[PDB]
Amino acid sequence: IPTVIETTNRGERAYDIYSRLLKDRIIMLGSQIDDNVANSIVSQLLFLQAQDSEKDIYLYINSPGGSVTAGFAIYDTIQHIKPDVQTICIGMAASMGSFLLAAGAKGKRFALPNAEVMIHQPLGGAQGQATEIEIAANHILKTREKLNRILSERTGQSIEKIQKDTDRDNFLTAEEAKEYGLIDEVMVP
Amino acid sequence: IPTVIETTNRGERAYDIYSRLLKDRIIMLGSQIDDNVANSIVSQLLFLQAQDSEKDIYLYINSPGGSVTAGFAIYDTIQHIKPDVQTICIGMAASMGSFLLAAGAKGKRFALPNAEVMIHQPLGGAQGQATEIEIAANHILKTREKLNRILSERTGQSIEKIQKDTDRDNFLTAEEAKEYGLIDEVMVP
Amino acid sequence: IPTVIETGERAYDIYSRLLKDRIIMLGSQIDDNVANSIVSQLLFLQAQDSEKDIYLYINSPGGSVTAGFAIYDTIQHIKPDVQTICIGMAASMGSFLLAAGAKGKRFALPNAEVMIHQPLGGAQGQATEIEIAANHILKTREKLNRILSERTGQSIEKIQKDTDRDNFLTAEEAKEYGLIDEVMVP
Amino acid sequence: IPTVIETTNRGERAYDIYSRLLKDRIIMLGSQIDDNVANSIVSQLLFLQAQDSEKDIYLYINSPGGSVTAGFAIYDTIQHIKPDVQTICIGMAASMGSFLLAAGAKGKRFALPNAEVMIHQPLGGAQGQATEIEIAANHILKTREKLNRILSERTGQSIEKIQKDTDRDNFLTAEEAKEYGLIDEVMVP
Amino acid sequence: IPTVIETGERAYDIYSRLLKDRIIMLGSQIDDNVANSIVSQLLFLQAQDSEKDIYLYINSPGGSVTAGFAIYDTIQHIKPDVQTICIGMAASMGSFLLAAGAKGKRFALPNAEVMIHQPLGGAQGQATEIEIAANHILKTREKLNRILSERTGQSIEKIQKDTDRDNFLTAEEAKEYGLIDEVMVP
Amino acid sequence: IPTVIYDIYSRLLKDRIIMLGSQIDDNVANSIVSQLLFLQAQDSEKDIYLYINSPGGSVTAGFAIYDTIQHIKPDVQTICIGMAASMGSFLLAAGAKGKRFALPNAEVMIHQPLGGAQGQATEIEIAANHILKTREKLNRILSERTGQSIEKIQKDTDRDNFLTAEEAKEYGLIDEVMVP
Amino acid sequence: IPTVIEERAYDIYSRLLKDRIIMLGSQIDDNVANSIVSQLLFLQAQDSEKDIYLYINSPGGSVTAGFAIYDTIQHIKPDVQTICIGMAASMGSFLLAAGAKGKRFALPNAEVMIHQPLGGAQGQATEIEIAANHILKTREKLNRILSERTGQSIEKIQKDTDRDNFLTAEEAKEYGLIDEVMVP
Amino acid sequence: IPTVIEAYDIYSRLLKDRIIMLGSQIDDNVANSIVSQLLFLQAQDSEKDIYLYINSPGGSVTAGFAIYDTIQHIKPDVQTICIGMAASMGSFLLAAGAKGKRFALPNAEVMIHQPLGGAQGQATEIEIAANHILKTREKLNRILSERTGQSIEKIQKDTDRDNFLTAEEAKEYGLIDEVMVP
Amino acid sequence: IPTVIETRAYDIYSRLLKDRIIMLGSQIDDNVANSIVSQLLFLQAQDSEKDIYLYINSPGGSVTAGFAIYDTIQHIKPDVQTICIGMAASMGSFLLAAGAKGKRFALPNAEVMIHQPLGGAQGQATEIEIAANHILKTREKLNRILSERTGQSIEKIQKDTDRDNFLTAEEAKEYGLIDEVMVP
Amino acid sequence: IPTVIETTRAYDIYSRLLKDRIIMLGSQIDDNVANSIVSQLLFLQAQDSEKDIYLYINSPGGSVTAGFAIYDTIQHIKPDVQTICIGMAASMGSFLLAAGAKGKRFALPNAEVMIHQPLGGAQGQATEIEIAANHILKTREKLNRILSERTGQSIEKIQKDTDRDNFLTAEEAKEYGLIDEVMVP
Amino acid sequence: IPTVIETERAYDIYSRLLKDRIIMLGSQIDDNVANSIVSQLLFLQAQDSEKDIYLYINSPGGSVTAGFAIYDTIQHIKPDVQTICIGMAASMGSFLLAAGAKGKRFALPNAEVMIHQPLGGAQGQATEIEIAANHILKTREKLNRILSERTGQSIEKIQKDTDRDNFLTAEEAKEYGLIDEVMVP
């Protein structure tokens, strides 16, 4: 991670490249989504709204997904803030990564031509007593319904179709992701 | 594991201690119940029926429990064979051990005075997709119903009461196990 | 494993004395070593008497499909009828071997469980190596479904549907399905 | 962990993203609650009161919970300081996290629409002699009572209801959490 | 474990040859596996002769309470008198079994040690789970103290006091306490 | 720990606040002793505020902090947050008289020191004598600081003794419970 | 391993050995090869005229261990029938094709797999060259022998073994690895 | 490394001359960094050439496409220079440079091959994984076909096993334009 | 361990047991002590008059396990001759001294070592005190018995066992740990 | 790693020596280390395309590929790169030492130079092992060819002398043509 | 381990050779091994205290303590104990070889003998290290003195020869006095 040096009338500024890009309202999500990652992204979003609530924000996504709970922290923050959040998929947007890709501002969800999108049903686990397993089962099914419902609103697909299409891992081309309604445009070079 | 050797007209017979007791129609269950242990108990039961279909068999139980399916293999074999199987609890009959104790011939289920009996919910696990966790949850809840129903048939308790009494680990005195109907008598002196 | 002595002096282990009554016990996972023992017992029993029934008790979570087919083919190869009796659980290749018993003589005890599902495998390496591995496992699936179809009376398409994920069956459901012939009372 | 560099009369002052938000009286909790996290949250609260004892503090919560003890250190510091501490649930407030969510200024406790709240009873361990195990059991039962008592005061639900509701893991939607009295309002986009 | 032979041909190990003289050697930690062997030997010895005394040698750090009660209850259930002889160390459940021997026939060799103490255990998980486990181990403590009171002649309250921490007793001190009846001479 | 290029603990040290929020080992004791010595050098008259959330740790490390507290000129106020257990409770009771506090839901625990002995009987005797000797040291100082007798403290610390904040005040480990 | 008593006491494999049946139900290493070879030597010494039955369920293994069994089969007087049950893979399928002509069998659902020998090489470039030459030379030996026993050309075998190649019993017969599929 | 605190390391120094250095395996972290450098350099100057030095055993196909698509998206020409080795996804990124501006040093090696992957689980899951990796192979082949001039059929044959090229053979293949002479 | 058959298959240790010889050639733990005690009780049952020969090559071990063997030796009727071969250290040297008076031997190059017992204690100060009190009491028990068996004063043994003390067989004889050094 | 502070700016000792156009190679040669050496070489050329560069070499060698990244960069850039062996130049380290500018290859009196044949490994099918064998033999030929051209030895002689580990004295390395002079004192 | 049946009684090969009064030492010398060999020597003496015993030695040595248990047993019993070195007699194994009956110590023509210092360890306080130091030095003296008596070599020579590993040819072992003859053919 290289450093960019910027000189001002008051003194020198040492930015790492991500922080230099944040200066231009660009946020780079390039890893698995967890609590520490979600914390960072939410904080960048809150900060950027505070700087200017009218200017667009650019969220670059290259992510195999991860925690559904961490993903919803990002999702809710995007919808809560005033600025439009553009979403750009580079490389891969899988599971919760694709859910956040589809969460960008209407008309401002993009994928580069060779980017891949994957949709699937959530993964979890349960150990212990039968009643403990029932509780964990009921919970994962409930979050599944919630993910499908929201994805339905954002793509225009029926909840029933999404249920069918996510039963097993579903890899989508950038053009297929447009057809599906996950993105609005493929950014042709 | 000590050896016992006996003289017959036509030569010498060296038995391990458990084999010598099996000659007298006694089976010792003193470990966790797994597929191997179940395979041994079932074979021992089938052998003893084939030797004499009239005479009682004696199953001593010191078991913390284990596999439900391995437990049912034993349970179903006990109910299938012609001879009465007496069940004697020594030390502890926990979980599937207590289910097997209650499975003995009615009137012939016993515990020694300081023996412990424990009843609980079946334990399990599942990892993977929501739908996979649903199948495994539905399954453990089904085997719980099955265990509760049989226990009800054998103890005289209601299914609703067994459901309540097994929600958490429930430790029983030998006399408490008689009152519950898991055994028939507490063996003095 | 307990010992049984009968009258020189015959010293049998418990499974060997049961083998004397033509009883074979499968109470573990099916791997090459297990399959080799079962096949060997089946060949021994036919060598002893090619007319008398053989009794195969099954309590198995399954295992190697290939080891399962060794047992399956040996059952169909030999002359004696092989009765299959499910105790506890017949899962994966276990259930397949249960359905493989002599027609009219496939049994389960009342509380025995049956589970049917897809074969499991793996593939690592180059795209073409993964393709070969996928083609292979999809072919063994078809082979399993076709045989299972013949033995149950269910269509190949139904078995494909019913095995997509783990399918737990009660003893009564297994009979209704055609995996067994009778549930054994008492 | 991105950097924000501000120009001040003195020179070039750089903050990590969380430190720039701290300047806006925003504290970000996005992890397990252990003694290190508690020490950090507490220090941030003590710092913000010293900067301004009148203005509100904003505490964002995305936490699986953790140490009851570390959780109470944060709870007690919140009630101690003069400024109102608004609490906002993003993603998940589970266990001691939901307790801290309920701990915000009354009328100023929030969750974003897709945030989840989980309540449960405390977890612990006890090894050794029967009397040592008795000491540990008595202690965890007292902290359970204490947690229930405070939650009652924060939510308006009875101790008897909370005890029943926290016997096993209890997952709540944002709207259910509001109904329960754990939060005051669900923040609409 | 050396072999002894009696002239078919009788090949015994040393413990097997001692079992002929109704001697059982308990010289290890007490678990279900060990309790299995001891209970079996006791049942076998009763079936051979229900009048003759049984000799139980004890060199044990103790172990599982429930496994110990399997042995304890079997000793009380069978017809023959079980003499207990402590060699080296009888600790915890070992000391409990030593005290369990037929009244008048509990022995320790002069330099043997006896230790009495609280039962040990563990609880993990929810507050309610820890409560159940705490209640259980307190209950079994009460059961052990109650029986030790009967067996030794000391009051329940004195045993509770004396087992709060590890309490090492000399052979003579164990006789004074009522755990044994006589110190074996010479 | 939110950082400015001043981490959060350094900004509080500027207010004469020392935060103890971990186990007490030689490194932690080093840091706190150094902070205590530093704050004295800044101003030898102004109070110091020591927040305690500690499961305890090394008796040796705790004593370095204890003795440093008594050695320096300024009063050191002790404030228990969350939990002060073991050597943490000892350091709580070690603050300036009238200036020992606990927040309402804070917990205090007192007990015996723990240790180990390995090797020859005489080596085990030396180590047993040493730990018994340090227990007497701790009990004596606790007696002086709580107002309870050494005889009662020996009884009360035989096993893990968990105290409520109001019970800790009643015991004399703290002076006040900080409302609200 | 169960016991059989006639008084004599065999394990089941030892019982079958009396009927001149050898079972190969594992990976082929030096230990396994030693046991098979010894059984073949024993059976010939018992009776040099009667057929031997070699049941094969093997994922294969060591080529060198496989050739120890192969050469022993061709060296002894009695015909060795090979019967594939379950799977004959790699060196296992090589030994299946090594059975007496007209007497190589597979059961109807048995699998046969053929492929390249596998190996490793570490060290200096010259050491890697030697190991490469060696494994290429053993490949040619395998192909040449398979060619004689199946009737397929060396060019064809080279191509069909380039990657893993799975065959049904019927396909294996058509290939020339076995003579008949054992019905019913 | 080496460092000026002023930290301002050697790569930051080169970044100011519009030089990006790829000297490791290609994963998401590396792709993140490269993509960010590419976007930053375009923001500094939309028309000035960018220089990307490649010494890589390859890595993630998905991360490799992140860098690839960013190269094609931005306005500046991205020159690619192979030093040492450009293997698998590395060689793919070398071929991705501005036409006429893909280079290798004389003793640099290039290796092309099939994509590598895995699959465990049910027959249907292995099928899904197999179909996907076969689809990404077609995707890689078609793009390489466009960038080298070779046909899809040829590239398929030539990438069946690991194929090591000299810099001169890489030029002949059309993976690079010139071999950089001293 | 080799087997010996009579006209009836013993192993070497089982064969020597017929000559009333018990071999102690390992650490002393509860398992070993169980075997030795059982052999002692077995040999008394056969013949309560004849001598028993206990060969000792041991680094010692559990003090508790040693006392099981010690107390059994004193309890039984026959004399127990102790012969040190190689090394008798820790509880081994204690059992060597436990032999019948006049009948404790070592071979010329056999070595004897005496030292204080070893132990461990973790936990609360009071638990550590109990464990310290215990090990000090067992040390007093050991010195007291060694005093009686050797003729040296309790105060001398205490001094001499402070650290590890290696004795030549001749030095062991002078100490009173053995009676004679067996020649040649 | 100590700091040097200049007043006019904190420097790493290495970046302070880089002001004097000195590059230090004091470790195994892998892709990271090569990346760093190449970057330093390209940076010094940007600073001054005419002035000489000083490459100190203390290396047990390593990756052949990473070694060639450095070698080709040295040949590519305009400035002369002097090579100085301190302690040990083994394997690829000796190849790089021999790759310095003509007349400007040095070793200190007690510095050791070791030459040997490249190492590798191959697992899998016969055909995969064949591919890996061919590749390493081809890089052996390439290394020997370049060494032949710079030492003045025949390829035949270099092949024989690199068959196994061949340790050379500083004077012996000079006789062999791997260096030009031994640096006195 | 192969079985041999006599008309029916089953021996393992080692037990069958023990019938012919042959003991096979083909392992490291430790307390378990010593216990076995000692028991075989006492067993063979009890069978016939006049007939010779044959001890075959293929051993890298091991425990000095365990070695002396065997050594002292050889000299204590009445039968002559022949020692035959096959393969290797090293460390304590060469000591036991020299410990056979005079005139009856042999090595097969390609067998190797090695003699050296005993090896040990010491951990803890200075006085504890001092104790272990004195012990192993005394043990060194005891071994040297016995080797001197059995080889006819001086203590001073053996001390110098065992300072580091000394590998001997069978013919060298004869000239040294560890054996009496090299066995042809």
Q: Name the amino acid, one letter, at I154.
A: I
Residue C7 burial class via C-beta count within 10 angstroms: exposed 0-12, middle 13-18, buried 19 and up: exposed
Give J23 to chain H, closest Cα distance, Å.
10
Residues in chain A: 189
List C-alpha distances in Å: E16 to C5, C12, E21, E52, J148. Answer: 18, 21, 9, 18, 81
Asked if D95 is an active-site residue, the reply is yes
Are E25 and I34 a contacting pair, CB within 8 Å? yes
Are K7 and K37 a contacting pair, CB within 8 Å? no
Distance from the Cα of residue A167 to its chain's centroid: 20
Are E84 and E108 a contacting pair, CB within 8 Å? no
Nearest Cα to Cα of residue A100 among A113, A83, A115, A117: A117
Q: Name the amino acid, one letter, at E46.
A: Q
Q: What is the DSSP string of chain I?
A: --EEE---EEEHHHHHHHTTEEEE-S-B-HHHHHHHHHHHHHHHHH-SSS-EEEEEEE--B-HHHHHHHHHHHHHSSS-EEEEEEEEEETHHHHHHHTSPTT-EEE-TT-EEEE---EEEEEEEHHHHHHHHHHHHHHHHHHHHHHHHHH---HHHHHHHTSS-EEEEHHHHHHHTS-SEE---
Total Cβ atoms within 10 A of residue J124: 15
Q: Which residue in chain I is spatially nearest to K143 when comparing CA positions?
A: I109
Which residues partner with J114 through β-bridges?
A: J90, J167
Cis preceding linkage at C110, omega within 30: no
- Which residue in E40, E77, E95, E117 is the catalytic one? E117
- CB contact G55 to C (< 8 Å): yes
Contact D133 E122 (CB under 8 A): yes
Are C184 and C125 a contacting pair, CB within 8 Å? no
Residue F179 burial class via C-beta count within 10 angstroms: exposed 0-12, middle 13-18, buried 19 and up: exposed
Resolution of the solved structure (Å) = 2.3
Torsion region of H18: left, alpha or beta (phi above 0 gives left; psi -120 to 50 gives alpha) = left
**Distance of alpha carbon E93 from alpha carbon J83, whole angstroms:** 78
Architecture field, domain G1-184:
Alpha-Beta Complex (3.90)
Which residues partner with A86 through β-bridges?
A: A58
**Distance of alpha carbon B169 from alpha carbon F22, whole angstroms:** 36
Is the domain A1-189 a CATH 3.30.9.10 member?
no
Secondary structure of residue F50 in the 3-state scheme: strand
Which residues partner with I24 through β-bridges?
A: I56
Torsion region of C145: left, alpha or beta (phi above 0 gives left; psi -120 to 50 gives alpha) = alpha
Helix residue ranges, H only, chain E: 14-19, 32-48, 65-77, 93-98, 127-152, 156-162, 171-177
Q: Which residues of H touch A90 (CB under 8 A)?
A: 31, 35, 65-66, 69-70
**Three-state SS sequence of chain G:** CCEEECCCEEEHHHHHHHCCEEEECCCECHHHHHHHHHHHHHHHHHCCCCCEEEEEEECCECHHHHHHHHHHHHHCCCCEEEEEEEEEECHHHHHHCCCCCCCEEECCCCEEEECCCEEEEEEEHHHHHHHHHHHHHHHHHHHHHHHHHHCCCHHHHHHHCCCCEEEEHHHHHHHCCCCEECCC
**Distance of alpha carbon G165 from alpha carbon G152, whole angstroms:** 15
Q: Which residues of B touch E35 (CB under 8 A)?
A: 30, 62, 90-91
**Distance of alpha carbon A97 from alpha carbon A59, whole angstroms:** 11
Are D159 and D121 a contacting pair, CB within 8 Å? no
Are A42 and D89 a contacting pair, CB within 8 Å? no
Secondary structure of residue D10 in the 3-state scheme: coil
∠ CA H141-H146-H149 to the nearest 5 degrees? Answer: 100
Q: Which residues of F touch D16 (CB under 8 A)?
A: 2-4
Architecture field, domain K1-185:
Alpha-Beta Complex (3.90)
**Distance of alpha carbon D147 from alpha carbon D163, whole angstroms:** 10
List C-alpha distances in Å: F105 to D149, D153, E127. Answer: 12, 14, 19
Nearest Cα to Cα of residue F20 among F10, F11, F31: F31
Q: Name the amino acid, one letter, at F77.
A: Q
Q: Which residues of I touch F154 (CB under 8 A)?
A: none
**Distance of alpha carbon C14 from alpha carbon C148, whole angstroms:** 33
- Which residue in I14, I90, I93, I147 is the catalytic one? I90
Calculate the dihedral angle through the C-alpha atoms of C57, C61, C65, C68, rounding to the nearest 10 degrees.
-10
Rg of chain F in Å (alpha carbons): 17
Q: Which residue in chain J is spatially nearest to G163 when comparing CA positions?
A: J125
Q: Which residues of F touch D38 (CB under 8 A)?
A: 21, 53, 81-82
F48: enclosing H helix or E strand: strand F48-54
Q: Determine the residue among I90, I126, I161 to mutate to test chain F binding: the one whose Cβ has the most chain F Cβ atoms within 10 Å.
A: I126
Which residues partner with I166 through β-bridges?
A: I113
Rg of chain A in Å (alpha carbons): 18
Distance from the Cα of residue I122 to its chain's centroid: 29
Q: Name the amino acid, one letter, at A187.
A: M
Contact K72 I107 (CB under 8 A): yes
Q: Name the amino acid, one letter, at D63.
A: S
Strand G118-124 with J119-125, pairing: antiparallel
- CB contact H48 to A (< 8 Å): no
**Distance of alpha carbon E14 from alpha carbon I41, whole angstroms:** 10
Looking at the annotation, which residues of F are catalytic? 86, 111
**Distance of alpha carbon C64 from alpha carbon D55, whole angstroms:** 68
- CB contact B40 to C (< 8 Å): yes
Total Cβ atoms within 10 A of residue B70: 26
**Assigned CATH for F1-180:** 3.90.226.10
- Which residue in A19, A67, A120, A152 is the catalytic one? A120
Angle between helices F26-42 and F59-71 in degrees, nearest 10: 10
List C-alpha distances in Å: C4 to B15, B23, C42, J117. Answer: 8, 8, 22, 67
**Distance of alpha carbon G40 from alpha carbon G17, whole angstroms:** 10
Q: If contacts are CB pairs under 8 Å, which of residues 136-165 in chain I contact chain K?
A: 163-164
Secondary structure of residue B143 in the 3-state scheme: helix
**Distance of alpha carbon J94 from alpha carbon J114, whole angstroms:** 6
Contact K42 I21 (CB under 8 A): yes
Helix residue ranges, H only, B13-158: 17-23, 35-51, 68-80, 96-101, 130-155
- CB contact B135 to A (< 8 Å): no
List C-alpha distances in Å: D181 to D107, D186, H176. Answer: 10, 11, 67
Nearest Cα to Cα of residue B30 among B69, B72, B1: B1
Tokens of D152: 């009652």
Give the one of B5, B18, B92 whose C-beta lies nearest to E12's C-beta. Answer: B5
Calculate the dihedral angle through the C-alpha atoms of A110, A178, A63, H72, rounding to the nearest 10 degrees.
-50
Nearest Cα to Cα of residue B85 among B65, B63, B102: B102
Total Cβ atoms within 10 A of residue J77: 18
Are B90 and B141 a contacting pair, CB within 8 Å? no
- CB contact E130 to B (< 8 Å): no
**Distance of alpha carbon J96 from alpha carbon J83, whole angstroms:** 8
List C-alpha distances in Å: D146 to B127, E128, E138, F90, K101. Answer: 35, 15, 25, 24, 86
Which residues partner with G84 through β-bridges?
A: G56, G106
Give E136 to chain B, closest Cα distance, Å.
7
Task: Kindly tell me whether chain H and chain F come into contact, counting contact as 3+ Cβ pairs under 8 Å.
Answer: no
Nearest Cα to Cα of residue B168 among C146, A129, H165: A129
Are C75 and C69 a contacting pair, CB within 8 Å? no
Nearest Cα to Cα of residue C3 among F36, B15, F124, H65: B15
Task: Kindly tell me whether chain J and chain A come into contact, counting contact as 3+ Cβ pairs under 8 Å.
Answer: no
Which residues partner with A87 through β-bridges?
A: A59, A109
Query: What percent of chain D is helix, strand and coil (3-state, nearest 5)?
Result: 45, 30, 25
Q: Please, which residues have CB within 8 angstroms of residue F109's CB and are 6 or more apart in sequence?
A: F83, F84, F85, F86, F89, F160, F161, F162, F163
**Distance of alpha carbon E184 from alpha carbon E55, whole angstroms:** 14
Distance from the Cα of residue B45 to its chain's centroid: 13
Write the class of the CATH domain C1-186: alpha beta
Nearest Cα to Cα of residue A188 among H73, H147, H65: H73
Asked if C92 is an active-site residue, the reply is yes
Q: Which residues of D touch F51 (CB under 8 A)?
A: 42
List C-alpha distances in Å: D151 to A38, D45, D60, F104, J46. Answer: 28, 22, 19, 15, 67
Give C63 to chain B, closest Cα distance, Å.
14
Nearest Cα to Cα of residue D189 among A56, A146, A79, A102: A79
**Distance of alpha carbon K94 from alpha carbon K113, whole angstroms:** 6
Nearest Cα to Cα of residue A120 among C80, H121, J61: H121
Q: At residue C178, what are phi and psi to the nearest 5 degrees?
A: 100, 15
Are J56 and J25 a contacting pair, CB within 8 Å? yes
Q: Determine the residue among H54, H55, H116 to mutate to test chain J binding: the one whose Cβ has the most chain J Cβ atoms within 10 Å.
A: H55
Q: Determine the residue among D68, D119, D129, D162 to mutate to test chain E binding: the one whose Cβ has the most chain E Cβ atoms within 10 Å.
A: D129
Query: How close are the terminal C-alpha atoms of chain D, in Å?
Result: 27
Nearest Cα to Cα of residue A116 among A55, A67, A170, A60: A170
User: Hunting for tokens 């690895």 — which residue is that?
Assistant: G177
- CB contact H46 to A (< 8 Å): no
**Distance of alpha carbon G23 from alpha carbon I111, whole angstroms:** 56
- Which residue in C117, C136, C149, C155 is the catalytic one? C117
**Distance of alpha carbon A100 from alpha carbon F135, whole angstroms:** 59
Contact G132 J117 (CB under 8 A): no
Give the one of F2, F21, F160 whose C-beta lies nearest to D39's C-beta. Answer: F21
Distance from the Cα of residue H101 to its chain's centroid: 14
**Distance of alpha carbon E122 from alpha carbon E135, whole angstroms:** 12
Q: Please, which residues have CB within 8 angstroms of residue C157's CB and are 6 or more apart in sequence?
A: none
Q: Half-sphere exposure of residue K67, counting CA atoms within 13 Å on the CB side?
A: 26
**Distance of alpha carbon H42 from alpha carbon H70, whole angstroms:** 11
Torsion region of J177: left, alpha or beta (phi above 0 gives left; psi -120 to 50 gives alpha) = left
Contact G57 C37 (CB under 8 A): no
Q: Name the amino acid, one letter, at K173.
A: A
Calculate the dihedral angle through the C-alpha atoms of F165, F166, F172, F174, rounding to the nearest 10 degrees.
50
Q: At residue H140, what are phi and psi to the nearest 5 degrees?
A: -65, -45
Total Cβ atoms within 10 A of residue E81: 16
Is the domain H1-182 a CATH 3.40.50.300 member?
no
Query: How close are the terminal C-alpha atoms of chain G, in Å?
Result: 28
DSSP state of E79: S
Query: What percent of chain B is helix, strand and coil (3-state, nearest 5)?
Result: 45, 30, 25
Are G125 and J120 a contacting pair, CB within 8 Å? yes
Q: Which residue in chain A is spatially nearest to B125 when comparing CA positions?
A: A127
Rg of chain G in Å (alpha carbons): 17
Give I138 to chain F, closest Cα distance, Å.
9
Secondary structure of residue H25 in the 3-state scheme: coil
Secondary structure of residue C129 in the 3-state scheme: helix
Helix residue ranges, H only, K48-125: 64-76, 92-97
List C-alpha distances in Å: J31 to H21, H104, J67, J70, J91. Answer: 11, 17, 9, 10, 16
List C-alpha distances in Å: I164 to D66, I53, I65. Answer: 52, 28, 21
